[PDB]
Amino acid sequence: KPRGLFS
Amino acid sequence: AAVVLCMDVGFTMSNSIPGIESPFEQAKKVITMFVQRQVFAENKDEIALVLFGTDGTDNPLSGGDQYQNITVHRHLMLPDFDLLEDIESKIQPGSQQADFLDALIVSMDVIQHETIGKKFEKRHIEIFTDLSSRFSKSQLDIIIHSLKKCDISLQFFLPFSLGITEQQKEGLEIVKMVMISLEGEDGLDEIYSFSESLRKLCVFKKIERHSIHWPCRLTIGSNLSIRIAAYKSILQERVKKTWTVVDAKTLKKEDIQKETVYCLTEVLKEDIIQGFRYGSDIVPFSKVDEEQMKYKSEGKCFSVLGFCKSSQVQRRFFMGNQVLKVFAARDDEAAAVALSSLIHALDDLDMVAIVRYAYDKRANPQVGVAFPHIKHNYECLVYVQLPFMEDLRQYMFSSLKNSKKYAPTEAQLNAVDALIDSMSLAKKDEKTDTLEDLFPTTKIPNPRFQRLFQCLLHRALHPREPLPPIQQHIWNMLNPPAEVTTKSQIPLSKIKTLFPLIEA
Amino acid sequence: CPGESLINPGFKSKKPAGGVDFD
Amino acid sequence: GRDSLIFLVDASKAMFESQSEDELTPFDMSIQCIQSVYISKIISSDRDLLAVVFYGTEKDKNSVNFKNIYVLQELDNPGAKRILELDQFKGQQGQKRFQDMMGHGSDYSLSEVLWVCANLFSDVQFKMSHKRIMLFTNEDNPHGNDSAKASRARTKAGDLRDTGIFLDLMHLKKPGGFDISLFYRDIISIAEDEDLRVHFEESSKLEDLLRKVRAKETRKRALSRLKLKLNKDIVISVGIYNLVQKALKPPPIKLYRETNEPVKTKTRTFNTSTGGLLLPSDTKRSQIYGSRQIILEKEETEELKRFDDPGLMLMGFKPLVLLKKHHYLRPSLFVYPEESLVIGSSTLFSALLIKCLEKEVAALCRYTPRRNIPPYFVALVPQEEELDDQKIQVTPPGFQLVFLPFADDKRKMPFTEKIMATPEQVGKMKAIVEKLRFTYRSDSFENPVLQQHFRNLEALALDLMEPEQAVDLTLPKVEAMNKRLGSLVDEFKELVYPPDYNPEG
DNA sequence: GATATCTAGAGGGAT
DNA sequence: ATCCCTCTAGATATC
């Protein structure tokens, strides 16, 4: 699940 | 979405094992590659940079000895190449030590005070530190309450994956406790290392566009109608922005003009007539007369001409430049049941639907195939355009199976068979014919956009240098895994000595 | 040679259209 | 090469007559057939050469000065003017016009007529792939009257046969049959159809001749000639062909106002500050990202698209089950070996094709069609040759080049909840599907836009009273479908739709 | 403001 | 030198 720095 | 990067520039990150790069360099590289993705993927996101551990002090909160040695280098604003230049050059390691809890206090202050007047769907705080600074835990309770109230996510980036000093081990205890108190046990998966973060950010963000909602009705005859929704699924993606021609001495697009001229030798635009070629003759055909005689159709039609066997529609005949996925109308249980019945009926009988599709009244009508596509999460019809009578090329080629000159021997066939086994791109697993792909070619970003963004970024940062060569990691993802190449070294040699190839 | 166009040699005569014919 | 065809219409003594009184005469029936060929040729192959020659008249118009043979048109590309000229003799009100400007009542020698046709062929400057002559006659008596000239006729016919002339025959109406082989069966190509019947029905192959052809009919040519590289040193040469191509309306031509001549157009770029002109080397390409303007040269813009040399590079072999039918990007191509570049490519190509079919695998390759284009990933799906009951090839043997999509080519779909249907509902829809079954063929539908466009051009070029309306075969037959289904639709709607639903709104 | 289509210009090969 | 075909840019509607 990509969130934060990766989204 | 508002993102605040909290980076440690303390003295402890300056020194490390000479055999590996300093954690300060790794954090600088990670942040730089994150900003590059945001700049070239215009998504209106806001980025703010906070540094703790430097000599200077610049915070909204000063107080006494606390909240010091921290500087808000960059406020909350859109990313730009000025930020990239500042990160590359202005940011330098410090010599002081700061509490990353105190840095977390300032990060909340920045994200809370500067978010007024704007709406953000998400809020994130990223911490880059090595947890090698002595600190006192005396306020944790109010921080955890504050984050749960403001709904702000956290991520931690450590120089080691989750031979370290007890201070780092002790410091690891608090961050483990924080992630538990914020986002449960799976919060353990939101702590990253610089190595794996570097791997995940090596490529630019893939170009993404939102398919529009296309409502219509699937008609079978005249008394049967199903409300459907269609979206574009697969298409040849293009660049978001095109090159703009500007003058070479002022770099302005308004100082040039493009015009067309007609010569027999000078003709005005109002003294020309549209015409068509009919064999060896030319007949005048007025544009206004054309639209009077153009084919006229009622647009927005999705009508089923009939159903045929799936085997009768070969894949090699697919035409068009798009693939449509047809779902039921949004918030319509009656339409969902009706479309589900058609999909399951087609799948059980192994049949497909031949439909007539027109985008609107200005679109040329099309004839395509709608075949069922059933998954465990959703089910829908897939529309691909089918050829007309005029689009078929009837070429004839000489046969190869019954050719004496080009008949391979049994030794040549054996060599080719060995090559195919060695160069296999898939492997069976679990003894249950579970084929996994060693080279998907569908999760790979388009190298055209990756190369273009690299050149644009290099030119902006260094406007007086030639374009750099293609990145090494780009070639790696464009090539099969190394074990595939190694296994084929021997079979390829056998083919070279068994098939005499001569270039005339 | 059967299966050719009397108008254009080198191409087989195309069967005329007629679209959908239910069984 | 260019196809060449010569029509040879007789008007000797009786081709203006009919055994009945309500059907077309042999003369105007032949004229209608010729006009249909011109229209078919114009649409299909405007580069071909066509001509019309009349024999048996009193006058002569030819470069040989032999009486009783008239050449109405020489070998040239078809055009609207020629069709209109032939319209002067179509049916009634033109027979007397033909019988005034020309006329029947003169003896003719068939040997001399073939000589005129041979001379017409020799006058062509271009290279002719096929040289054909079509005979339009319904009378075979005079050759039996004088065997001396009859022997000359077959002697000349043999001379034309070895030259490369493939003479044909198109008999017209004649009482008592066409009594074939009385003088014929040695002049014609006699390829087949040696029916001893006199053919009381006097239309053997005029039915398909009158069938108008409306298609581009492009000849075979290789899209590209690339090199398939198994590795850096094993290289074979293959040819790329497109078996499906979107047919487009011909581009409009800019015409002058009164003199009606084509005008050449070019695009020039000039700076508005001075009104001069700007060379292509005096401008730079620019883009805006962030708050900075990035400037690149024209050459640098092209150089950032260069990845690999043109050709196909073999990455590996993938099972056919890993290729998704819904992962379609663009029309597929056809790969066939080319022995004119690398000797021995066919042997390796056939070996790869045979084993790929046996093991059901697809060769995944990196495709660069030409210079300075980023590569794509393609799969070479093996394709076995298919033969019909007539032993005529319908699917060529080779490899099918299937474009695979990148991550950028896939769009995210909106979230929806699955709604399974009860078996009763599926059963009713199964009956509906079974009722509307039909056999699908790739050539079952025609482009309504293109077909209507061709009718409009024909009407204006031939000043017809009103254009012919093409029948749209892609329109669903609602009347037929409603009759076939019957009460099935009403039952299905009752089972699915509650009695308050409004699908129209 | 982006999304999507048809139409109208530049550009690389095949013959 | 002509024609064919992919690519790029330009003009026009609904979302």
Numbering used by the authors:
A (entry chain F): 293 to 299
B (entry chain B): 8 to 169, 196 to 297, 303 to 542
C (entry chain C): 180 to 202
D (entry chain A): 34 to 538
Reported in the publication:
Nonhomologous end joining is a critical mechanism that repairs DNA double-strand breaks in human cells. Nonhomologous end joining (NHEJ) is dependent on several canonical proteins, namely, the heterodimer Ku70/80 (Ku), the large DNA-dependent protein kinase catalytic subunit (DNA-PKcs), DNA ligase IV (Lig4), x-ray repair cross-complementing protein 4 (XRCC4), and XRCC4-like factor (XLF). Following a DSB, the first NHEJ protein that binds the break site is Ku, where it rapidly recruits DNA-PKcs to form the DNA-PK complex or holoenzyme. PAXX (paralog of XRCC4 and XLF) is a more recently identified NHEJ accessory protein, which structurally resembles XRCC4 and XLF [reviewed in (11)].
